[model samples]
Target: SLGLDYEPSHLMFLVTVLDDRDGEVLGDAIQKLIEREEVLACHAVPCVTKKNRPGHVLVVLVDGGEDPDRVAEDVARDIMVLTGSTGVDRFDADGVYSVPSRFEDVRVVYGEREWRVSVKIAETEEGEVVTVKAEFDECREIGEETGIPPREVKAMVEAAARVGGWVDLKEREIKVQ
Candidate 1:
């Protein structure tokens, strides 16, 4: 069970392709579809091609409330237009959408010396980086899990690479707001 507020509606499809270029086209098309749906995440994995095997598989995860059938139909149509793929193979089921305990686009890293929480705050292409570091004692156990130290150990958190001359690391939490 991933740290998701709620379960996810999952949809998966496989597309046949001749080469990597075709896979890229289909991947991009699927990404666009996911974006339009405002889903949690979409991933396209390349599979080895055999005599009757698929070249790529795309997985999409959204809030559990969303309609999976509609998403499947849209994605199938887009794939056909983008790569001339006729139909997509999908499982008729729903599931959860969870990530690897990540914040924003950055994944927390746990080090022997300290725990680090770094993130980029920007909507456009470029944004400044914000990093928060905590000592081993401060975030004793959570630090091991999420790279976020505990509240009492080191007794502090620090930030750097800040934009707008603003950064806040209170207690054991790191917040951009």
Candidate 2:
């Protein structure tokens, strides 16, 4: 809990599609996203948003731990369907996920201790999956996503990493955490 004004607390995932999409092209695409129902329900702003880039439109995504392929697919489907711009539409999914900012340098308050957990390339366990603590500053984010109250959002994401899926709540796991 140090440095900068309005310090970004949430995990903001940014992926760039291969194209010279800036200015009104980007604006229209963003407007399209805003008008849609799926994106309108997104937690903070929209999970998917188009920001700035030199000769490229940087797409910002949220809560993207599932897979790069799905994340890329999400934007591709949205932007393509909206703008009809088809220049190298498909991005290398690996590149989207490869950005290290998606993983580290987050300090979130959980219970009494703020745990910092980040993923690593390991054949040891979890098989090349997210390894970070996934600690969030705002308990409200997790609570908003899951039915669990803000009182235990810390426990939820911590336990969520160990559990198979996030949305479904198994009494054993939820109570276990």
lDDT per residue, candidate 1, 8-81, as tens digits?
44544334344454535755676576666535466667677766566656554443235666766665666567
- Name the top lDDT candidate: 1
Best of the candidates, TM-score: 1
lDDT of 2 by residue, 1-177 (tens): 121123222233434353453435666666666563333222112232345433444354433344545654575567666555563233222322231223332233333334333322222232443344454445556456445575565555555545422323334233222
- Reference-based TM-score, model 2: 0.26
Query: Which 10 residues in a row give candidate 1 its minimum summed lDDT?
Result: 122-131
TM-score of each: 0.40, 0.26
Off by over 4 Å in 2: 1-23, 34-58, 61-63, 88-177
Candidate 1 ranges with C-alpha deviation above 4 Å: 1-24, 51-54, 62-64, 92-177
